[PDB]
Write a protein that binds this ligand. Sequence first.
Ligand SMILES: [Ca+2]
Ligand SMILES: [Cl-]
Lengths: 560, 258
Amino acid sequence: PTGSNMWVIGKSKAQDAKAIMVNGPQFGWYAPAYTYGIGLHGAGYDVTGNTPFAYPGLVFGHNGVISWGSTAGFGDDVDIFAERLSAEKPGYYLHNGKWVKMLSREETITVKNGQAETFTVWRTVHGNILQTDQTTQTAYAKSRAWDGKEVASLLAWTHQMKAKNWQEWTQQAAKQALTINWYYADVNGNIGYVHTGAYPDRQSGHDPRLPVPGTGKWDWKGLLPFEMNPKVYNPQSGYIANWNNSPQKDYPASDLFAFLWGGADRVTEIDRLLEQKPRLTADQAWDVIRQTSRQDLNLRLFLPTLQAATSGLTQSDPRRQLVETLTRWDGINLLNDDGKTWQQPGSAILNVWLTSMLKRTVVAAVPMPFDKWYSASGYETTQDGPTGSLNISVGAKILYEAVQGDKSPIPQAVDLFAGKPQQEVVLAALEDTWETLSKRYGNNVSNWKTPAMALTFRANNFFGVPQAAAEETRHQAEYQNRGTENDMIVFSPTTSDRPVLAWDVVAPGQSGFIAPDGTVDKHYEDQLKMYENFGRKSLWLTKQDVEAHKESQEVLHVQR
Amino acid sequence: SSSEIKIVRDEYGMPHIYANDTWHLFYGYGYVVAQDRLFQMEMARRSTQGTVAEVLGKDFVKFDKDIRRNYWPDAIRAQIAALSPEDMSILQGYADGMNAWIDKVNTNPETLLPKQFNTFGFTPKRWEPFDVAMIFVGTMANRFSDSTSEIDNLALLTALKDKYGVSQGMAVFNQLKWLVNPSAPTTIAVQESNYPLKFNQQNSQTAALLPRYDLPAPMLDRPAKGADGALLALAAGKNRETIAAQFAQGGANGLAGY
Ligand SMILES: [Ca+2]
Ligand SMILES: [Cl-]
């Protein structure tokens, strides 16, 4: 699920509590809500929280002893095998010296007010065929390390909810086969992290970023043991922070071209806030959502470069004055009172500058039409706003390595600046930026009212399929680079006699029900304003707390 | 009671299920889900199984084929068939619970049928354990833990080698798409541990073994969406042009993004 953040604060770093867990899974924003609030009590379970698509297993929740969360792992658990075909053996591929018969199945798509279509799906020992290049006599099969373990993963996410300590919980973490960061906290203040999933034990020499021959010599050896999954229990830092960044030193990322783990990483924004104060309260931990949601992610990366490039320029030089505006700014975007524009113009300045930089550097070094994979600054959006999290663009991460000079560990096989001093290129981009922005907004930087990003709870689910009527779409003025939902669990708080306190927000509301006559449920939209203003509602666990907050009840008698 | 399931909803309508065995507990969960999110769950079911066109028409045919081409349902069924009685009870109870509410809905549709079923012109059918498993499998696994662009990467590598020659093309590929970068900020501090498997440029043998790849990068064939998040259902040609324009403009953060 492309974005997701988490910060877990342990005993050594928590104020007025023994542990604090704050999770912000980013799936995009939908109506009705992407996640589902649910409490389960009996059959060995005693839990509360919320979970995507109402899975049996709560991804975000606690059981009164321990609490858990997730963020997308993005490890490389998928490789593509280039299968060798034969004109003499249609539907076969060469594997371990023999012509092996592909599996195939016929599927018929029934179409409302149209003619049905039938097609075939093919599969090899390495997975389903994605495509076939018949001129090259190759079929590409997608091999997932978690193939065969999909159901076990769903069950691992359910059974983990019964764990009472780290050892029991990691026994279920070892069964979860998708590439997912899992997080743990408990009543005693212990905290932990596991970069869960099945990862292939590849042959020596296998470059996991590119396909390998499917004829047998490059077949995976099997799966790596759980010992190899990156994990930490009670880190000496006292905290665990993640925003889909690398789990651990030397661990390799997904092979997706647009995904990189490099020196420029948005997780640094969470890390600086956690290291800043010796200890954090649950309220301060919750406030990290607001701050990171509004943080421009590029300012910190490129300010030093911009400052150096403009250091000897005159006070009247507009390239310098754009950088002075940026230097004065902390990069936190805030709406003006019109509910449309941002108080400061820095994001616009960075967008234009970075777009110009990338056009001049990474884009110019990559052949068309692949240059268009590295041109985005990451800021360009639509009137409805971002469909997910915002990140530092892939082109920006590459550019960051280049502007770090010999501080970067990445050999610059091609000088992205093409023989020109970097200062010249950075200043040219600033000249472009001043031209573009001063023509649009005038020469008085202090009155520039640049467009803020908005947020939309879309009526189509992430697949692009309607899950509500189009009129059910909801809008919020302020885009916030945060979880679709946010949940926080606090263990052994000094502000209560309860051993655990928990809060969440499931917007627009718990219910998506609309009666036939159009009456929307009483819980159709009661968490929308709360979402917008960084509010939250208590999650109950105990029978006493559920009962005290009881709105309605139903008792059923059923036999299986 | 063994047979008793108690459902308590709080002040935000969040359900709490009280039951005495696995099947009853998950039945309560499925029941409340069908009460709260039946249309959403029905469409998620169709999304995860590639049966959207059946109710929404021709614009979702390519989508349905793509979903079906990306998994092997009999393998999921064999996983479910292997489950112990206790594990099967989670899936079966859940489905059974949904079904109890769905039957009540189709018996008194005038007040209980979600409005959207009338708007979209169909009624909800019962759920099986496979359907429940497929909500998860189709979302978390088949979409969110299935990220690879190796064929696109081979396409880019072919182009880099054509522009720069073979060794330099590969070296520029390593600059743009590094295997690992020691300066990446890591969730686990280096004082704690490091990953024992050391991946580097030197040892790779497989990049040299593949065919030069010249068809359109496959990322250009993902179905384009507009600003409402809806599928555009375009010709293959206009789809590729839409994805390229959207990706050049917004990259991974944009409309054709990740
Ligand atoms: Ca791979
Ligand atoms: Cl990007």
